[PDB]
Amino acid sequence: TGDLINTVRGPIPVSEAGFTLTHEHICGSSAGFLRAWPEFFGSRKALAEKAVRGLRHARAAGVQTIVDVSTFDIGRDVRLLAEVSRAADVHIVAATGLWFDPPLSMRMRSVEELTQFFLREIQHGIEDTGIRAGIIKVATTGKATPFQELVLKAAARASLATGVPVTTHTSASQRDGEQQAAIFESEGLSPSRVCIGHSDDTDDLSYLTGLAARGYLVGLDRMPYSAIGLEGDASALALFGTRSWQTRALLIKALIDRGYKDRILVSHDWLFGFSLAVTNIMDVMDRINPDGMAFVPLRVIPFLREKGVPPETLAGVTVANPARFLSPT
Amino acid sequence: TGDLINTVRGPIPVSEAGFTLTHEHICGSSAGFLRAWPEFFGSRKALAEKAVRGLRHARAAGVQTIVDVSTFDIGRDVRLLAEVSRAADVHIVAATGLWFDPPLSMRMRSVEELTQFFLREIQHGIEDTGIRAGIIKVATTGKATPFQELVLKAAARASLATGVPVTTHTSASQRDGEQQAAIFESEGLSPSRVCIGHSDDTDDLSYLTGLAARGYLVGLDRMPYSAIGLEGDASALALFGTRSWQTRALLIKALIDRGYKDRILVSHDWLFGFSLAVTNIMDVMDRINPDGMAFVPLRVIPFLREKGVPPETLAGVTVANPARFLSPT
Ligand SMILES: [Co+2]
Ligand SMILES: [Co+2]
Ligand SMILES: [Fe+2]
Ligand SMILES: [Fe+2]
């Protein structure tokens, strides 16, 4: 009680976050895209409605909070987030940082400047809204680019200054987490303030246990993603992989079995709109996982219980871990 | 009389465009950047004020219209343009198209989709404003990327459908114009609807005359840009070049001397804010060219007259050529 986290509708007690999905999206897009070309999504109204329906479904399944890790370059639209959050009655935590699609205007900035931008979004508010970011999202896709190194350093600096956690995108097969950790540690950031994302994209437990042993959160955040049965579709295969949801889920058990229950964060990396991919992908995704953001509570959690994970352990993963991670520290 | 062109404040008679700068920017930025981080520019208010001052200065020097060729990916802000246009009493023509910094959400689109986006901006309006684009801006930086080819084709298609002209960014030293022309012609676009930009960045008149002979407009649009005296500054050298304004200006005479007066368009490619470059560049630019967008009327035109170009020829370049180019055809 009494620690607070910022959401798109304002501050909430940490204890109110409850069952929380720590890596999600309302819309995966680009800065200004939804504004310039809402028809891409049928309409802004249609997108919002679809999002409210999905969130209501998640809520019925027990989800109380989502962390929307859409950055400026993922086309994050805080007004949209606030609208859908209110209508679905689900908390949404907004993000700052930068993903792997930064425009030149960001790419040309110094580490000091980036830090100031991240700080603005956390401390003051996003755009002209007063809506403050509750998390910092950063990314590599293999070995960090020089700009990416700066971005990670700025993220560490903003976090140390505000207590807001850092969360990442990785090319998990390339073990990006090791480099990301090295950079964060070089800045003095505690591993406990950091989640190494898309970790379920790999079955290399040496890599994963290695991070966990050091105190990192391991983000198992792509639970619904599989191209199994549609390798006909090349975009889907590259995007979704050939591993099943069960294989991904088994990683959660694997880590618990290895003593790392307190270090796990679980999510879908789902969305309700998606312009970051060729046009048909959203439909394909909807066909594969109609449960959307209810998939983890509906399918993953019962799978785990059936494999013998205790309910209290599962509560700790879905409730306690997100609460510790989010609470500014 | 009676042909109309769209501006940020609405429709105007073509005959009212008058002395027109066909390649300009209020702000060279990125989509959503000015919204997310106005402090980068001191403030939105400060940027607008600086722009009004520069435009008023241009207006006093005789400029009546500018074409702001900032695309979605140049962070074009139509509301800003409209605000400054009204306050400075200078017409501004807005653009659609895409520059060389497109985000993934654009990169992932088909030629058909891009065409629909360009058409939306021309026919319906930009974002939710009702402000319609009067031009299409496209870009290559050397050999066209595959996406760039699609963008050029969509631009040709939108132009044929609406009559709005197409204007380009080139790496002039690499002779991009030849390839851009080939693609436009493959789509059936008339060369008269096309301006091949940044053509003053090269002294290869074989290249330039070649375009002109085919009926292309040659955009001599970087008149004030030189790093002479500041090769100490590496960013400035790469950006500005080592050729003087006089050398650039001589190209205008060169083309007139070769029979191509009707094929020339002249501009500054100036701006009042600039986040697309490292932070100090705007200041450096202001120091070199305090006249801003008044530089062409103040310095270039008198230089030309002094080298014997007749006033009526100069009027034709600065008034008649832009009018023919802009008038939807
Ligand atoms: Co990601
Ligand atoms: Co250019
Ligand atoms: Fe994501
Ligand atoms: Fe330009």
Author numbering:
A (entry chain A), B (entry chain A): 33 to 361
Give the text the authors published on this PDB structure.
They are binuclear metalloenzymes, highly efficient catalysts and display broad substrate specificities that include most phosphotriesters. The active site and substrate-binding pocket of the PTEs are also well defined, with an iron-zinc binuclear metal center co-ordinated by four histidine residues (His55, His57, His201 and His230) and aspartate (Asp301) and an unusual carbamylated lysine (Lys196), which bridges the center by co-coordinating both metals (numbering for PTEAr).
To investigate further, we superimposed various conformers of malathion onto the substrate in a crystallographic PTEAr:substrate complex. This revealed that the substrate binding pocket was too small to accommodate the branched leaving group of malathion, with particular clashes near Ser308 and Tyr309. To investigate whether this increase in activity was a result of relieving the steric hindrance that was inhibiting substrate turnover in the wild-type enzyme, we performed substrate docking with malathion and the engineered Ser308Leu/Tyr309Ala variant.
